[PDB]
C-alpha cells in the first residue's frame, strides 16, 4: 500500500542539528518509522533529551559530536556512523544559525559567521554523506534545511545575510542534484516559514509582528515539518530530486 | 500518536476529477488504501470501473460521478451528489487534464480555448465548488491541484504552448485560492509533475534520474497533501520531476 | 555608442491598449525614439489624445480599431498596420482588465471575461504579429504586459482571475520566446508593480493600503515604464528572450 | 525632456568592480560614454590600463583603483578614494566574480569558499560600502549586481556547484539589500547574464537564440539599471541569456 512508502526499516539515517526544533522533531519520527538514527549536534551533551525520546519509542540513538563548519569533525561524523551503523541511506543537513543586524552595520564577521554554518555546514555534510553514499552504490536521500527566507526577504527584522546564506542552500541543493543523479542520489530543500521553535525564540518580540503575515494566522509548530521530512526520506519521494519545498502558513504568496 | 497517524485518511470523503487513468486513478486508491470514502469523477461514467473495481479490491467502495469539469451546472451536481451520497467533502483534487500537439504559429483558437478550459476553468470551477461546500461546512478542508513541470518550464521539441499556458495558470490560480481560504482553514496546494509514463527517447536524456516517472510515483506526495502530515503547507507548488527543472 | 543602440528609427512598432496609461505612454516613447506607430484600443475614438501627442513630436500615428479577444479584428489590426506600414517590427501586446471579487462568489463569466482579454488577446496578438515577422525573414521583438500579479498574489483587493491571467501570461511568453528563437523574434514579458493609471483608478480605495506595502513608499507612475519598453523594443536588448522583468518598487521582494 | 533623457549620466559618479575585462570593461565604457565619471577597480591595477585608454577614446578621465573586493579595509579604501577624488558615488556596480570548474563529490573546502569569498562576500562589501557613502550623501543612489543564470539554473556539462551556489546568494542578497535601502531611496538590482563569450559547442545547441551573447550586448541593460530610466526598478533580478532557461 502507499502507507508502506513510508517505512524506513533498515536505513541509517544522520542528522545534523538534531538536539532541537525541527532535527529533534525529524529524528524522532526518524526513527518511529524504523529508521537507526545519528543525531549531531555542536555539544553532545544537548543531545541526551532526543536520545531519550527515541528509546522512548524503542530505539537507540547514536550521538555524535559535530562543529558541521569543521572539516576534520564532519569526516569524524561520517567514519563514526559508517563505522558504527555500517553506512548511511538518509543525511538531514539541517544545523542552522541566524541573528538580527541592519546590512548597513554588519561586521563582515557577523556576515561570514553565519554563512560558514548555514551554507558552509550544508556543503561539507552532504559531500561526505554523498560520498559515502557513492562508495556503498545504493543510492540514498540527502535532504537539507533551507527557509523561505530564501526566497523572500523577512521584515521587519533585518536578517539579510540569513536570506543570502538560505537562497545559497536551495540552489546548492539543485547543483548537488544534478551531479548525483546518476549515482541514484536524490537531493531536495525543505523551506520552512516561521515554526516556533529554539532558533526563532530569541526574536519573540517579532512574533505578534509576523503573525499578521500569515495567511493562515499562526507560527508552525516543529511537529508539523515531520511529515514532510519522512516524505523525503523514504521510497514515497522517489521521483523527487531537485525540489525545493515551501512549508510556510502561506507567507510566500502575497 | 507517531508521525505514520498523521497520514491516516479514516472518516475523511475526497474527490478526485480526471480519477479514470493516470496519476488520477493511482491516487484513488492510495486514498482508499489510506481510508478514505472516495469519490471519483470523469467525463465518462463506463471509464471510472477500472478505479472502481479496485477500491473494491483493497476493501473501499467507489462513488462514481460523472461530470465535465468544464460545465457549472455539471461541477455543482457533482458536488451535490458527493455531499448527498457521503455526507459532505474534506479533500478536492482537481486532477482532469488534457493536451495536444500545435506550433504556437499555427495553433486555431478553439485550440488554444480548449487546452485553457479544461486545465485552468475545469480547476477553477472544482476548487471553487469544492471550497463552497468545504466553507458550508465549517471544518476546514484540503485542495490539491495538478499543474506540470510545464508550468514552470518550456517542453521541447514537442510545441505545447497552450499547455504550458494553462499549468502556470493552475500553479498561480491555487495560490490565489489558498490566500483567499486560509481564513477558513482550507489548505490548497499544487503538484507540479514532470514526464510521467501513464517522445520517449527524446525525453529520457533530459531527465537527471534517466527516466520517465510512474503513476504510483505520484501517490506518496498527493497523500502528504491531503493528509494531517501537509498542517502547515498552504499556497504550495511541489515539482515532482527526476530532476527536469534543475538544469 | 549604447546610446544609438535605443534608437527606432525606421522601425514599425504595434501595440494594443494603447489609449491609456502604460500603453499610451509607450506609444509617445517609442515615437520619441523614432518608430512609426500603430496605436490600438477597442474603441478608436479613445485613441485621439495620444495620436495628438505623437504628432506634438513630429510623428504619425496610426490609429486601429481592435478587440483583441476577437480573431477577425486582430487579423484586420495586422493587415492594417501591414498594408499601410509595410510591416511590423515591434509588438507591445498590452491590452488587459481588472475586477475585484472574492473567488468563492466569483461567477464563471467575470472568471472567463479576464482571461479572454488578458491571456487570449495576447495569445491573439502576440501570434497575429509573430506571423507576419516570420513571413518577413528580419526577426523582431514581443513585448507582453504581465503583472506582478504572476509572480504574487495582491491583497487585500480579491483578483484570483486577474493573478491566473498574469501568470498565464509570463510563461505564455517564454513559450513564444522558445518557438520563435530560431526566427530571431525576441520574446519578453514587463511585470509592473501599482502604477497610478486607468487600469487602477477604479481601485482608488485601496492605494493607502497598499503604500506601506512597496519598499519605494509609492505607486509607480506610466512614465516610469517607458525606459524599459524601450530597452525590450530595440538592439539595446538584442540577446534577451523569454525574459519577465519585474518593475514593482520592490513590492515582490518581503 | 523625452525618454532617450532617461538614460543620461551626465554628472553621475560611477564605481565598477572587475572593470579590467568582459562586462565589467564594456560597461564601464558604456556609463562613459553615457557622460558617467567612471572609477574602475580591479585586484591588479595595471590590468586597468586598457579600460582607461578606451575611456581616454571616447573622452573620459577613468579613475583606476586596486582593490580586492574580499578585503573590508581596501574596499573601503576604494569608497574613501572615490569620494576623495570625485566628490561621491551615485552608482555601484558589483561585477567582480569567479569561475572553476570542479565536481562537487572532489571538491576542496578551500575551494568552494574561494568562489564564495569572492563572488557573495565581494558583492556583499562593495554594495555596503557604496551604500554607506550614498546614505551619508542623501541623494539616493543604484546600486547593480552582476549575478548568473547560474543562480536560477545548474550548468551541465561542467560541474560548478559553489559557482551556481554563489550566484543564487548574490541574487537573493540583493533583494534582501533592496529592501532594507529603499527608505534611503537607493535601488539595487542583479544582473543575471546567460553565456558571454567574454565547452562552446556543447552550450550553443541548449541556447535558443543559437549563440553565446558577446559582452557589448549587456551595456543597454546595466545603462537601464544605472540611470533614471530604471528609477522604480528596485530588488528585481534580471536574466539575459538568449533563452536558456526557458527550457
Ligand atoms: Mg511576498
Ligand atoms: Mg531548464
Given at each position: 500500500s502507499?502507507?508502506?512508502?513510508?517505512?524506513?526499516?533498515?536505513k541509517?539515517?544522520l542528522?545534523?542539528?538534531?538536539?532541537?526544533?525541527?532535527?529533534?522533531?525529524?529524528?524522532?519520527?526518524?526513527?518511529e518509522?524504523?529508521?537507526?538514527?545519528?543525531?549531531?549536534?555542536?555539544?553532545?551533551?544537548?543531545?541526551?533529551?532526543?536520545?531519550?525520546?527515541?528509546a522512548?519509542?524503542?530505539?537507540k540513538?547514536?550521538?555524535?559530536?559535530?562543529?558541521?563548519?569543521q572539516?576534520?569533525?564532519?569526516?569524524?561524523?561520517?567514519?563514526?556512523?559508517t563505522?558504527?551503523?555500517?553506512?548511511?541511506?538518509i543525511?538531514?543537513?539541517?544545523?542552522?544559525?541566524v541573528?538580527?543586524?541592519?546590512?548597513?552595520?554588519?561586521?563582515?564577521?557577523?556576515?561570514?559567521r553565519?554563512?560558514?554554518t548555514?551554507?558552509?555546514?550544508?556543503?561539507?555534510?552532504?559531500?561526505?554523506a554523498?560520498?559515502?553514499?557513492?562508495?556503498?552504490?545504493?543510492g540514498?536521500?540527502?535532504?537539507?534545511?533551507?527557509?523561505?527566507?530564501?526566497?523572500?526577504?523577512?521584515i521587519?527584522?533585518?536578517?539579510?545575510?540569513?536570506?543570502?546564506?538560505?537562497?545559497?542552500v536551495?540552489?546548492?541543493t539543485?547543483?548537488?542534484?544534478?551531479?548525483?543523479?546518476?549515482?541514484?542520489?536524490?537531493?531536495?530543500?525543505?523551506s520552512p516559514?516561521?515554526?516556533?521553535?529554539?532558533?526563532?525564540?530569541?526574536?519573540?518580540?517579532?512574533?505578534?509582528?509576523?503573525?499578521p503575515?500569515?495567511?493562515?494566522?499562526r507560527?508552525?509548530?516543529?511537529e508539523?515539518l515531520?511529515?514532510?521530512?519522512?516524505?523525503?526520506?523514504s521510497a514515497?519521494?522517489?521521483?523527487?530530486?531537485?525540489?525545493?519545498?515551501?512549508?510556510?502558513?502561506?507567507?510566500?504568496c502575497?
Amino acid at each position: 500500500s502507499v502507507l508502506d512508502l513510508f517505512d524506513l526499516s533498515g536505513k541509517r539515517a544522520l542528522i545534523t542539528g538534531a538536539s532541537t526544533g525541527i532535527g529533534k522533531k525529524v529524528a524522532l519520527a526518524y526513527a518511529e518509522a524504523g529508521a537507526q538514527v545519528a543525531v549531531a549536534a555542536r555539544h553532545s551533551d544537548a543531545l541526551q533529551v532526543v536520545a531519550d525520546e527515541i528509546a522512548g519509542v524503542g530505539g537507540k540513538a547514536l550521538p555524535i559530536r559535530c562543529d558541521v563548519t569543521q572539516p576534520d569533525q564532519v569526516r569524524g561524523m561520517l567514519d563514526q556512523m559508517t563505522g558504527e551503523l555500517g553506512g548511511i541511506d538518509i543525511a538531514v543537513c539541517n544545523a542552522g544559525i541566524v541573528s538580527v543586524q541592519a546590512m548597513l552595520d554588519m561586521p563582515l564577521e557577523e556576515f561570514q559567521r553565519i554563512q560558514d554554518t548555514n551554507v558552509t555546514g550544508v556543503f561539507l555534510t552532504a559531500q561526505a554523506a554523498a560520498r559515502a553514499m557513492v562508495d556503498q552504490g545504493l543510492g540514498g536521500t540527502i535532504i537539507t534545511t533551507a527557509s523561505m527566507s530564501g526566497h523572500i526577504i523577512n521584515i521587519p527584522q533585518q536578517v539579510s545575510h540569513y536570506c543570502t546564506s538560505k537562497a545559497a542552500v536551495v540552489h546548492l541543493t539543485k547543483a548537488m542534484a544534478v551531479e548525483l543523479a546518476p549515482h541514484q542520489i536524490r537531493v531536495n530543500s525543505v523551506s520552512p516559514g516561521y515554526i516556533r521553535t529554539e532558533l526563532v525564540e530569541p526574536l519573540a518580540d517579532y512574533h505578534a509582528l509576523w503573525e499578521p503575515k500569515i495567511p493562515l494566522g499562526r507560527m508552525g509548530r516543529p511537529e508539523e515539518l515531520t511529515g514532510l521530512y519522512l516524505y523525503l526520506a523514504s521510497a514515497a519521494s522517489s521521483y523527487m530530486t531537485g525540489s525545493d519545498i515551501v512549508i510556510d502558513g502561506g507567507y510566500t504568496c502575497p
